[PDB]
């Protein structure tokens, strides 16, 4: 038996809401150390890596490594039947072709029990080259979402320029161009309002806005986001999942 | 002649919003004891029965029993035009076949006078007698609304199974299957957000989920809903209309 | 050079919201006396005329009259990017391309520099010249908005009847008919409905409700609206924008 009881159900709701548009199907690599997902998106452009560590779960049980192939659109639909404050328990027999999802209200008067059909899929594998990056921008998650959205009216691509004297997002198109300059803070007082740049050398990279606008569906999961960049390698957009792990999205620059 | 004055016109806005999707035209039986509507949907699976007592109105007079044929699409349109806190007055002179509806804004600035056909058409008048039911379930209306909404993502039918210690709703379909068990809870005193059962013998019936989703548009009219059920007879779904009367939806099971 | 600055970002946004569904490509006349926009809408039915005097901006400089051809949907989008508390700067250097729109958030965290390509359109004019009208009605803007919206459920045309009593809007279609009567009560009254009317002779004209429902998108720009009517000429619906300027709509009555 695999069995994982997650007390804050909102978290799994949000993860599915952040993945279902970008990718339709993917295998859930389950083990004693946690749950891990790794997939390309459905247009073969970006890469996604999800991690939810075992200890994040209130109760956790994994007799042996499972791989469950999963339609995320169906999984999301089922999770929309969960409340935000439900305790969600995930359960699969060792080689069973189903995943049960139990949504307990907090007072135990209402209990729901769903049994999802798996789909049978060939796993993907990479993980990408772990790297020391030139720039790391930490910033509010709501601010990053709004920027990508604003600039998507102007252009299909965004140039992210970092230097010592700031970060800048620029886009360009048929109706013109725009530049959004977001200043580092010093003493912001809260921690989650900070804009901090860890800079080694200036960098200027171009990314497809369409894909960044997918990545920002993870905003509910965290109040900050970090962007790690270096020349000619994929951007990582990282959202922390409430002490349990993370959702990274990798994207090639143009060129 | 007919005239009924209702100071809390918000109630009548809620009833028409409850009726307009399911039923398109209906007979309005007006008498000195009040308003009684009764109709099948255009597909013959369900029946609605509405009752508004004369004493529920601020003023009421009926000279003359009347069977006004009414287009509920058109009446819901006109009611849209009413303020939330307008006084609503319904009116019919005699050998005129028109229903007038007068909305007087809260601080007598503005009177709106509306009038609609009153197409007296070949119709019905059933009733169907008092039955004794195997189960009667009372529960919060918003909770029944939620279970019908969520299960409609899974299948197009719901098995309702009643038992001493609770009621279950189960559905099955494309993306897998689902059951929601609500427990009898007692409490009472501080609120009736309870789930109570009255069980002479257990019941187990399948119903059309889309119809139950029409019925739940009445959710805003009452904090609770009752479900009376028996083998082979139509389910009743009752909503109380704040000390003026009731709204009952009737649905026959399958097989 | 042209340059204008405003603290009231919001007003600009509301002007574009109120124009952009009626007209696509527009020509802004920028002179030293201010900004002027005059155009038919894209169906050649109604006429719009916007005026924003130079004094209404808290800085204003214009060396040379410019005719800046803009797509109003694209400019509404851009202005959607700005904080409602943002300081806005409009800037152009004289012709081809660049209108620059700069949004500076209140305390210096964020600056947004946009640049809109201008197309070459001729500066229109015609400026149909003023008149004394049989009848001039002034009323709450949100009440005028609500009357057009509601009657649009009954009919496609409204008949405005002005009289010493007050003003009456009446519409008629398939479902039946409706009239709304606002009366002149005296003075010193709490209700915000002091509908006032300056009158030479009762008028009675019909108007397409589709277009009136375009003109009420200006509702946020002012709390009152003034209607000016005579037989055989266009209605004028005027929103005064706070001694900054005005937005006028012209619609001819049905024959």
Numbering used by the authors:
A (entry chain C), B (entry chain A), C (entry chain B): 1 to 255
Published text:
Monoubiquitination of PCNA represents the key signal for the switch between high-fidelity and specialized DNA polymerases to bypass a variety of DNA lesions at stalled replication sites. As a first step towards understanding the Ub-PCNA/Pol η interaction, we used EM of single particles to determine the three-dimensional (3D) structure of the native Ub-PCNA in complex with full-length Pol η and DNA. A molecular model of the Ub-PCNA/Pol η/DNA ternary complex was constructed by rigid-body fitting of crystal structures into the EM map. The structure mapped the location of the C-terminal domain of Pol η, elucidated the mode of interaction of the DNA with the complex, and captured the conformation of the ubiquitin competent for binding to Pol η.
PCNA is a DNA sliding clamp with a pivotal role in replication. Not only does it regulate the activities of both replicative and TLS polymerases, it also acts as a scaffold to recruit various cellular proteins involved in DNA repair and cell cycle regulation. The crystal structure of the PCNA, which forms a toroidal trimer with pseudo six-fold symmetry, could be unambiguously fitted into the map in a distinct location. PCNA instead of Ub-PCNA was used initially for fitting, considering the multiple conformations of the conjugated ubiquitins on PCNA adopted in existing atomic structures. Cross-correlation coefficient was used to distinguish the current fit from the one obtained by 60° rotation of the crystal structure of PCNA along its pseudo six-fold axis. The reliability of the fit was further supported by the agreement between the identified positions of the ubiquitins from the map (described below) and their expected positions when covalently attached to PCNA in the current orientation through the Lys-164 linkage. Consistent with the presence of DNA in the complex, the central hole of PCNA is partially occluded by a conspicuous density, reminiscent of the DNA passing through the ring. Importantly, this density adheres asymmetrically to the inside of the PCNA ring when the map is rendered at a slightly higher density threshold, implying a non-uniform interaction of the DNA with the PCNA ring. Intriguingly, our model suggests that the DNA backbone interacts asymmetrically with the central hole of PCNA, only forming stable contact with one of the PCNA monomers. Furthermore, the DNA transverses the plane of the PCNA ring at an oblique angle of ~13°.
